[PDB]
């Protein structure tokens, strides 16, 4: 074996060369927070939420993108790792709209949850927030782009897995927007999966819209029958009524996606 030895908080772990910092921390049961990293999409490195201190290094590294060198001690819980996480969460929540009650992502929001777990408890932003024009990409995905945090999981899903190349970023700076730039309708056979991986409620399910809320739903693990792939699903119900259908991760079938008929 050619495994290199690295350290996560002093704990030795033997990792394959080419492994990122985030995967090396995954191997000891620590989960580095993330918004743009996804293990089935390409590495983006553009939310900076995964910034972690390697010790004896005066700069945090994007753990989703940085490969481990031999002998690093990844400080997942040091003071400047936490200051980096609170600063990046402050910038993510600076222009974010106060929509948490009227948002379908509430209760199951990555942004809410790791704002609670890794960011500050309050605001210093005394300014006015931006407001993004909404888009119309079809009858399946409700689009409220003020909630977008520009993680580009849209674009990497549509380009790399759905293979569509219709989503992109237009503009520059804080005015950069996610969309198709024209009135174009994103209707793939895998189009609803962008509802799953959007960490915020910028892309939501238009059929599921406003009807339920994640804590009150019951999660029955079950099988798709819309094709002979046999996708593993979660039928989430509420008070004896089927509310929605999510995927289950099965690595050998449907890795974590389902089709739009299934959904």
Partner 1 sequence: ALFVHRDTPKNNPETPFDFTPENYKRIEAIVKNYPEGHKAAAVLPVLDLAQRQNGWLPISAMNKVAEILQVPPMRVYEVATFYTMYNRKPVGKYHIQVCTTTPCMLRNSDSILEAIQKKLGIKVGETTPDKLFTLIEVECLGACVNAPMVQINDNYYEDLTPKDIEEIIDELKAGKIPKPGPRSGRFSCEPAGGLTSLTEPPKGPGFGVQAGL
Partner 2 sequence: KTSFGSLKDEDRIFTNLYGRHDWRLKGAQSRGDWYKTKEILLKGPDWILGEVKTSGLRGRGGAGFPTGLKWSFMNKPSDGRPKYLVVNADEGEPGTCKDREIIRHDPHKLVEGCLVGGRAMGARAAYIYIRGEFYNEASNLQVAIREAYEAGLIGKNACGSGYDFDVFVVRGAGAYICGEETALIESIEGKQGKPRLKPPFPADVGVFGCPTTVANVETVAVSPTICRRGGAWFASFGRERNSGTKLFNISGHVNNPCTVEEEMSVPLKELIEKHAGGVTGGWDNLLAVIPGGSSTPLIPKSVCETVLMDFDALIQAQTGLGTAAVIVMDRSTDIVKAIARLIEFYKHESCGQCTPCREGVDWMNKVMARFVRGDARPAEIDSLWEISKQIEGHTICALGDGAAWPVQGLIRHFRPELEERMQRFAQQHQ
Residue closer to ligand SF4, measured from CB, 13 or 192:
192
62 makes contact with partner 2 (CB under 8 A)? yes
Q: Give the residues across from 221 on adjacent strands.
A: 234
Q: After which residues is the chain broken (C to N over 2.5 A)?
A: none
34 belongs to the binding site for ligand FES (CB under 6 A): yes
Residue 149 touches ligand SF4, criterion: CB under 6 A: yes
Choices 10-18, 62-70, 189-197, 209-217; region in contact with partner 2 by CB under 8 A? 62-70
Question: 88 is written with which tokens?
Answer: 């990046």
When binding is defined by CB under 6 A, the residue of 178, 190, 243, 245 that contacts ligand SF4 is 178
Coil, helix or strand at residue 154: helix
Residue 183 interacts with partner 1 (CB under 8 A): yes or no:
yes
How far from chain centre, in Å, is Cα 193? 12
Nearer to K ion, 65 or 234 (CB): 234
> Is residue 38 at the binding interface for ligand SF4, with CB under 6 A as the rule?
no
When the beta carbons of 24 and 246 are compared against partner 2, the nearer one is 24
Which residues, 6 or more positions from 140, have their beta carbon under 8 angstroms from its beta carbon? 187, 191, 192, 195, 205, 206, 207, 260
* Residue numbers 89-128 binding partner 2 by CB under 8 A: 90-92, 94-95, 124-128
Is-contact 37 22, C-beta < 8 A? yes
Question: If you write DSSP's letter for every residue of 184-229 in order, what string do you get?
Answer: -----TTTTHHHHH-SSTTEEESSSTTT--GGG-EEEEEE--SSSS
Residues 88-127: x/- map of binding to ligand SF4 (CB under 6 A)? --------x--xx--x-xx--x-xx---------------
Token pair in block for residue 159: 């380009």
- Of 172, 174, 215, 241, the one binding partner 1 (CB under 8 A) is 172
Contacts of 239 (CB under 8 A, 6+ apart): none
Edge-to-edge, what's the strand order for the sheet holding 61-62?
Answer: 11-15, 4-8, 73-75, 51-54, 61-62
Does residue number 198 form part of the binding site for K ion (CB under 5 A)? Answer: yes
Complex with ligand SF4: residue 145 or 226, whichever CB lies closer: 145
Residues near ligand FES (CB under 6 A) are 34-37, 45, 47-50, 62, 64-65
Residues near partner 1 (CB under 8 A) are 133, 135, 165-172, 175-177, 179-183
């Amino acid at each position: 074996s050619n495994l290199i030895e690295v350290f996560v908080d002093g704990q030795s772990v033997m990792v394959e060369p080419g492994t990122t910092v985030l995967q090396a921390c995954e191997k000891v049961g620590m989960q580095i927070p993330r918004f743009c990293y996804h293990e089935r999409l390409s590495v983006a490195g553009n939310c900076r939420m995964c910034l972690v201190e390697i010790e004896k290094a005066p700069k945090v590294v994007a753990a989703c993108a940085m490969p481990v060198m031999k002998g690093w001690n990844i400080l997942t819980n040091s003071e400047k790792t936490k200051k980096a996480r609170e600063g990046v969460m402050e910038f993510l929540l600076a222009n974010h709209p106060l929509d948490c009650p009227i948002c379908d992502q509430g209760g199951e929001c990555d942004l809410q949850d790791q704002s609670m777990m890794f960011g500050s408890d309050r605001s210093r932003f005394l300014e006015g927030k931006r407001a993004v024009e909404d888009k119309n990409i079809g009858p399946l995905v409700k689009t409220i782009m003020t909630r977008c945090i520009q993680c580009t999981r849209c674009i990497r899903f549509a380009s790399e897995i759905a293979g569509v190349d219709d989503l992109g970023t237009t503009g520059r700076g804080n005015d950069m927007q996610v969309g198709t730039y024209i009135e174009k309708m994103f209707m793939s056979e895998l189009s609803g999966n962008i509802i799953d991986i959007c960490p915020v409620g910028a892309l939501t399910s238009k059929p599921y819209a406003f009807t339920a809320r994640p804590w009150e739903t019951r999660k029955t693990e079950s099988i798709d029958v819309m094709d002979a792939v046999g996708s593993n699903i979660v039928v989430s119900t509420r008070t004896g009524e089927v509310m929605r259908i999510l995927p289950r991760m099965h690595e050998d079938i449907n890795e974590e996606w389902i089709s739009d008929k299934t959904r």
